[PDB]
Write a protein that binds this ligand. Structure first.
Ligand SMILES: [Pt+2]
Ligand SMILES: [Pt+2]
Ligand SMILES: [Pt+2]
Ligand SMILES: [Pt+2]
Ligand SMILES: [Pt+2]
Ligand SMILES: [Pt+2]
Ligand SMILES: [Pt+2]
Ligand SMILES: [Pt+2]
Ligand SMILES: [Pt+2]
Ligand SMILES: [Pt+2]
Ligand SMILES: [Pt+2]
Ligand SMILES: [Pt+2]
Ligand SMILES: [Pt+2]
Ligand SMILES: [Pt+2]
Ligand SMILES: [Pt+2]
Ligand SMILES: [Pt+2]
Ligand SMILES: [Pt+2]
Ligand SMILES: [Pt+2]
Ligand SMILES: [Pt+2]
Ligand SMILES: [Pt+2]
Ligand SMILES: [Pt+2]
Ligand SMILES: [Pt+2]
Ligand SMILES: [Pt+2]
Lengths: 729, 729, 183, 183
């Protein structure tokens, strides 16, 4: 029994062994935030917000008490029109043209488990007994809108999951101009905020800032969760690090436009909203309809960022991911993209397949260029049928060949996109998202499909099914190579064009859900010009995602590091690529590229047939060794040890029993006169004894965590070393 | 010859001896920002933006060139729907329901002086030869909208002034959901950002932040410029201080809802927007109509914040304030507020007046409670007739008395407000701003008038004319004690309710402009529960403003320090008030309250009546010494010397010829073992010799600036010392 | 200046040295790659450019050089001989410190008629931020010709607008500029 | 060699620490109460700490702000002491290091310390460095070569180490001539 309501002081308490979350019903039925953090057995009103007449903080309608104010009260939610001047969680537009909404407590329910969210990805349960959901309903008596705020707490996790459902119980339509998945207000907290900004080929660097008075906004208008700002944010103490201190993590389960708002206000209080971005968002909610927001995963750590990340990793992997492959060792694959680009045909590929088999690789993935008349990126998107000139005997002939060599076969699609030069565009020009009367803006010389329309989705779905029903395709790489720029859905009435963005995501999720449910034996790898759509929402459909088009060993360190902040390592893929590196020109050791690529799901993206004997056997070695450790590297508890700014980046994985650990240490810059460094470990059992499988020497878990060991001093830039420890008897 | 166009290179160049502003016409008629900073004689294409194919940064419609992108280019302006993913300067809603706008260069003009802005305050010229205004026109060929971008440069100031004018030349209406006054994009700049946040009784502290990737927003939704965030912002170098380094100041001349946005993007560039907040903004622009934005003042300093501030001080004072009182010394006044509140009558007033005359005070201001049945803050707002119970012989009788004693007479008004309990609400209930069918939220148990409506404005105007036309009031304190919460204008169609905020301000400007124009010989002082409306646009109408309801000497240090960042000191009023302070209970020496109140325009807010002859003399000594210095302290060039955080706050004023200087040094905390500190002066002539009028010792300007002098060691907290230097012959 | 002759590490060493000591007082030699002291791999051109900050020398087996390198040397030396009066003895201005990812410096002759600038980029990124280099020690009112491009800029321009650094792939790249006042 | 005491100054201190093959990185610290010591016992001025120190405002950089530079004209053991005391005052000594220093001064004898060069800049570190550069080059250096273009030389150390004899060297000399080298 995880959720209690005290009808004396009007306080809700969600709790388990790790965490407590307290909210209350304050004056004027105002839903108040009291506390989120380490568990407490009881609550006794010691956090009732102090009453004070604060200038220009107006009061409740008809009220004479000036010491109470929705403008100063810490709250679970807020709207325009209630004498609150923070940025509102929700803004509604009424028929009279106003933006008034005044929400007051109405009722609450408590359910076991948690409800499925319609049309949306979401966390779930295997057994009802593993979670409880509190649902608090608030109402505007005048507009007759009802807001349901959902709170789910898992029995065994430091997590609270929040989302919103809006119901129009009135006579007339209303527009939702903004509806946040959650709002959280802190009193007397001096946080810093961590986010994951980036760019294409440069995703998710950790960033950490002070919070000043005003509003800090982390968001996306790109119609995707984006390269530039991941839909995640963490609030930490100034002293919090990877191993110690409190951290609040917030992850939005949504793959479209997001908005994270972090505001310190005039009274030192910190106010946080998260949800669908309100930019060009305006949803027509007719009488008797409802609107469901994506949910947000909230994690509380009392002991550092690693622990925080670890609770995200666990929840995502166990109660979000639905792929039957999520608990299966991922194949060591070779992708031909950086190897041949478009410059290839069947025979060229077969030779790569042959080299693959010899090297011990498990899968061949045919990348962009196999379809329509795709000789470069200026045509064919929308034409998902094999390109005869390249596969004169059809695609199944080639798939049969890969399988005969002993490999699984993968295939690249980009289902959301259309070229001017395609049969699809010639046959259904109106499938192309643009504002009628305006030339749409090109990006990588292609355009976006109107995925909000069922007839558009059906067309692509029927094209892909022709190819996939053979069951010759064991794996799909679903790519997506540009942002949305021209926002329109040609079937919606003018007053509904504010639904385009979100409908697109709904269409997307629907199309993806259809395919992923129909082909439960296909391993789906998400991609969006790298990690352009790398979020908890996407995880629900695709159990792994290509982390970045940047495949430099060194730059990948920071990218994979930041990615690991939220996402489990089995969810990101990393490939050994050529040197000098195609994206930045860096020259790196082959061994280093390998070691960095073993952090994610290992692959190869380079022309195996143009490799030196020295390298062929390097691959044979890497693969053979990876196959020994990948159960631990792919699925072990992840601990980050050192961040690249130290000049080293180091991480490690430990199996669930603390019997096996795999550690990697990478040195960035070399110096003529090096300082000695030690690496200390984490996640081991203090009392067990661990053998270094390379050296055969044995150390207690306490030793490895407290004494650590000296890193070997080496000359040359960009070197890696790897360790494998195993508990003995 | 301030502004040149090079039709060959398509570069616009605004410059004088101090600053250079460069912009250009890039591919696809995109208006690009090149440079703003120290003057250069010439430009030779060296700042042409590098072409690089950046992932996911899309291209011009129909373009095949991927290396050019409105999402990466530094620009003068931006909109939604142009393939740009920064926060846009302007967002337009079209009849088809889309938010698409694509502005392309159309043409330009260069004019002498600067055009007036309709309905809005603005800077101006006295002689046309003193400035030139570039107006670049951008258009959307499809919707047929035209944006006019105004750029004014004065011949002798380091100031660019910007604003926007939007013209609908199409057949149908369009809605403006956002129109910023200016956008500015920087390349390869590492800035900190300075703002002035606060709260009521706590305005404008200086806050200084790093800029990380994402968007930092500083704003107000209160319908006023506000106590919480002043409509000011500066970007500075990490090393910039009061005396050295780059600083860019931005001051929005507007008194309603503002939004400053500072965004570092995925490419390390800095994108800045400023204008009317788009919160609940939706302006219906009908065919052949136009919309004018407030303007923004831009200062470039190459030698620290003092210089920046001074350029703002000089511009506001010389080319914005219209009051005939702007160059005139301000009266040392006594206000009966803190002194007696609503507790008073015609004969108790006379006693205060009598004591005032004896102390050498020059004006008596009558505060709240003289009108209606105003016995407290629960009635009477909107009934601007004399409260006879309190003035048996009418107000004109009492005014005559004040004039007999030799004092000017001042009167408090709050014309924008209305109480439920008032004759106005009984006669005209619909004058009260609320959303029909919703009980509005009270604040100080009062409400706002619908100043958007002419009939409401007319009513107030005529009440005030009845009081003022016999010219017995020499001074008006225009107060305003709550924010706007219930946003509606009853005479507007539902689809124009997004015009309510801006219409309120425009209506406020109309009414205020009428009174100020009609009574040019009245000294207007602005007020909004302190400095809740302390902005450049307010300066245009009222030459001075009540800085803060906080009258504690020590807290006024940072309030006044911060205020002086933008606003000339003659624009802020400061009153010696009683100790212990009414607001925070601090105990301070009377001399210290004096010294701090001499930074602004000196006044008194204490019961002169119940005053000992013993301290009455201190008041005579203060007033007397202030009359000695006030020409210099009120209108001299202001230099901040030390900030409160140092444990000392110090400042000085120097006259235009650098013959006279007045310096104040205030110590905050005493220490049992204090460090010797020195104070060094600024703004003097190195080669003049100055006499300290207290000691009669003489020092060179070089000495006073390089060597400085020891601050005297004093026991006790909150102590002040003043210095008066006069150049000798 | 140092037994360390890596182009990159020499940047910070020569930078700090310049804090007190005139550049003619320190000597710098182009050495082999990979570098003998730390193993770093650097462009030959970069080693040259960094070694032209001090008094240029060579410390490597000239007889084991590739034709490509022999002529690299011939070029470096021939060009150094054109500029060394200014590089060795001009007023020194440091422009950027290596922690910025660039280290940049320049020399200007006593008349402000001639300036030699060097800009070195340490780390490359797949997605580079644009950078400008602005100059110092020039005459605001004189006009300077970029001897490579033949374009001309006022001293005020070069000090206030500066110019864009060219975006290049690969670690450890250098670019050099030579400006001369005209009439 | 000198002592200097400041009142009401909030300095940071810049020194040039390092090691062999890693000399003179710029280092910049706050000055806390107590004694900060930069020194050498090595009998040389040393790789590890150059005999120089600068005091600057928190806001001073390469182009702006005040800087005090102190350079000891001595090539043996040095000691730079920087002390903030109980009253906020900053106290600075520089001279021969006093470690195992004990000089017997007999009747009628004298003892001369090395001197220290003190430079004041009102506009950044470049200007400071520039005054050191000028003074050193013009009024300290006595070599007749100080104003002469330095030869572009080839040194055989990293080329051959000890593994060489005459004929091996001659071939290097021949390659040198062809390459335009002067020494
Ligand atoms: Pt605890
Ligand atoms: Pt702990
Ligand atoms: Pt802690
Ligand atoms: Pt390995
Ligand atoms: Pt390093
Ligand atoms: Pt590096
Ligand atoms: Pt441990
Ligand atoms: Pt331990
Ligand atoms: Pt332990
Ligand atoms: Pt300048
Ligand atoms: Pt500067
Ligand atoms: Pt203190
Ligand atoms: Pt001065
Ligand atoms: Pt001076
Ligand atoms: Pt001077
Ligand atoms: Pt005084
Ligand atoms: Pt060069
Ligand atoms: Pt980097
Ligand atoms: Pt300059
Ligand atoms: Pt200049
Ligand atoms: Pt200049
Ligand atoms: Pt300066
Ligand atoms: Pt300075």
């Amino acid at each position: 029994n995880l959720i209690k309501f005290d009808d004396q002081n009007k306080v809700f308490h969600l709790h388990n062994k790790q965490i407590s979350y307290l909210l209350s019903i304050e004056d004027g039925g105002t839903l108040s935030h009291l506390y989120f953090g380490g568990a407490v057995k009881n609550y006794n009103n010691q956090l009732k917000y102090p009453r004070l007449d604060r200038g220009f903080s107006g009061n409740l309608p008809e009220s004479l008490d000036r010491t109470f104010s929705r403008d100063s009260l810490p709250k679970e939610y807020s709207s325009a029109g209630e004498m609150d001047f923070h940025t509102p969680a929700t803004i509604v537009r009424n028929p009279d043209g106003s933006n008034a909404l005044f929400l007051a407590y109405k009722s609450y329910k408590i359910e076991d488990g948690k409800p499925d969210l319609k049309g949306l990805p979401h966390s779930w349960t295997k057994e009802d007994d593993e979670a409880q959901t509190l649902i608090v309903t608030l109402e505007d008596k005048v507009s007759k809108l009802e807001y349901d705020l959902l709170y789910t707490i898992y029995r065994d996790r430091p997590v609270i999951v929040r989302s919103v459902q809006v119901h129009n119980h009135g006579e007339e339509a209303v527009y939702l101009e903004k509806v946040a998945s959650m709002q959280m207000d802190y009193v007397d907290k001096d946080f810093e905020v961590i986010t994951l900004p980036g760019a294409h080929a440069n995703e998710r660097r950790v960033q950490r800032e002070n919070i000043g008075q005003g509003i800090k906004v982390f968001s996306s208008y790109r119609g995707t969760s984006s390269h530039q700002m991941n839909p995640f944010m963490a609030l930490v103490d100034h002293d919090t690090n990877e191993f110690m201190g409190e951290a609040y993590g917030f992850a939005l389960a949504y793959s479209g436009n997001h908005k994270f708002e972090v505001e310190r206000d005039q009274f030192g209080q910190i106010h946080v909203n998260t949800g669908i971005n309100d930019y060009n968002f305006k949803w027509k909610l007719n009488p008797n309809e409802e609107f469901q927001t994506p949910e947000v995963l909230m994690v509380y750590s009392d002991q550092g960022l690693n622990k925080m990340s670890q609770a995200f990793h666990s929840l995502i992997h166990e109660r979000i991911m639905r792929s039957k492959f999520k608990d299966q060792i991922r194949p060591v694959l070779v992708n031909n993209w950086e190897a041949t680009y478009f410059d290839f045909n069947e025979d060229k590929l077969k030779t790569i397949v042959d080299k693959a088999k010899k090297l011990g690789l498990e899968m061949f993935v045919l990348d962009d260029g196999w379809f329509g008349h795709r000789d470069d990126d200026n045509s064919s998107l929308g034409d998902w049928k094999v390109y005869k000139k390249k596969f004169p005997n059809g695609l199944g002939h080639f798939a049969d060949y890969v399988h005969e060599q002993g490999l699984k076969f993968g295939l690249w699609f980009e289902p959301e996109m259309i070229s001017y030069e395609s049969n699809l565009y010639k046959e259904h020009p109106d499938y192309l998202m643009h504002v009628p009367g305006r030339k749409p803006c090109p990006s990588r010389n292609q355009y976006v499909l109107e995925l909000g329309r069922k007839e558009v989705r059906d067309n692509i779905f029927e094209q892909m099914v022709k190819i996939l029903d053979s069951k010759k395709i064991d794996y799909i790489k679903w790519d997506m190579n540009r942002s949305l720029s021209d926002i329109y859905e040609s079937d919606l009435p003018a007053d509904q064009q504010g639904e385009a963005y979100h409908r697109y995501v709904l269409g997307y999720y629907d199309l993806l859900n259809k395919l992923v449910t129909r082909y439960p034996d296909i391993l789906f790898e998400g991609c969006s010009g790298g990690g352009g759509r790398f979020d908890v929402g996407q995880a629900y459909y695709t159990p792994q995602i290509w982390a970045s088009d940047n495949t430099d060993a060194i730059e990948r360190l920071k990218i994979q590091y930041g990615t690991s902040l939220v996402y489990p390592q089995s969810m990101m893929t990393s490939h050994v690529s050529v040197s000098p590196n195609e994206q930045n020109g860096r020259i790196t050791p082959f061994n280093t590229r390998g070691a960095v690529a073993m952090w994610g799901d290992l692959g190869y993206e380079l022309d195996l047939t143009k490799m030196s004997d020295e390298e062929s056997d390097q691959v044979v070695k890497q693969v053979t060794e990876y196959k020994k450790i990948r159960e631990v590297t792919q699925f072990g508890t992840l601990y980050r040890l050192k961040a690249s700014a130290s000049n080293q980046c180091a991480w490690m994985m430990v199996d669930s029993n603390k019997n096996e650990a795999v550690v990697t240490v990478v040195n960035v810059m070399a110096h003529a006169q090096p300082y000695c460094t030690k690496t200390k470990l984490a996640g081991l059992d203090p009392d067990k004894r661990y053998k270094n499988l390379e050296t055969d020497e044995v150390f207690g878990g306490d030793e490895l965590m407290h004494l650590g060991f000296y890193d070997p001093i080496e000359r040359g830039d960009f070197k890696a070393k790897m360790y494998h420890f195993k508990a003995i008897n």
